[PDB]
Amino acid sequence: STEYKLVVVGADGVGKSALTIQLIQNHFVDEYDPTIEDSYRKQVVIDGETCLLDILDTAGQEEYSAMRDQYMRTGEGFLCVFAINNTKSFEDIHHYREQIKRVKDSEDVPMVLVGNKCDLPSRTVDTKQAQDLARSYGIPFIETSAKTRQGVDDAFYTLVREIRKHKEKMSK
Ligand SMILES: Nc1nc2c(ncn2[C@@H]2O[C@H](COP(=O)(O)OP(=O)(O)NP(=O)(O)O)[C@@H](O)[C@H]2O)c(=O)[nH]1
Ligand SMILES: [Mg+2]
Ligand SMILES: [Mg+2]
DSSP, X not given: OOEEEEEEEESTTSSHHHHHHHHHHSSOOOSOOOOSEEEEEEEEEETTEEEEEEEEEEOSSOSXXXXXXXXXXXXXXXXXXXXXXXXXXXXXXHHHXXXXXXXXXXXXXXXXXXXXXXXXXXXXXXXXXXXHHXXXXXXXXXXXXXXXXXXXXXXXXXXXXXXXXHHHHHHO
């Protein structure tokens, strides 16, 4: 049954890895071990379909643009992660989205906007501005905490649903 290529993107330190490790291994990585490029497989059942999630966990800042280009080419859907106490990471979503659209030569690419670290008090990106961005892109917005696991499954499952809808549209 269907495989889904998910790529988790976002700035340094936003919690891409912590989110992915909560999904796969059900614990919170308290440490900060910066990523080069990690990948994970997981079988799940989403809306009664068995899915093989093929997950790419990308680096916060890449050494080569061709390395960004490549994961953007292979990925079927993108988890666009920012941290709610990191304004720059929120602003980087624009720049991710532009690079993804350019690389794929398309205006309609499955994505979900994720505001991570919702357990913190340090909030410099308000919910309304995130929801506005998402509404503008025409994609879902999900608030998450990898610390507590709030929203983690919903984030990844929504992205799968987004890919399914995109496939069903692209046939029509
Ligand atoms: N309070 C809180 N801390 C978090 C959350 N998610 C990640 N962190 C913390 O933020 C730091 C960086 O997390 P990490 O998952 O490594 O971020 P990343 O986006 O994968 N970093 P890189 O881009 O270098 O791979 C770690 O200290 C981690 O524990 C969260 O939801 N809440
Ligand atoms: Mg990481
Ligand atoms: Mg990055």
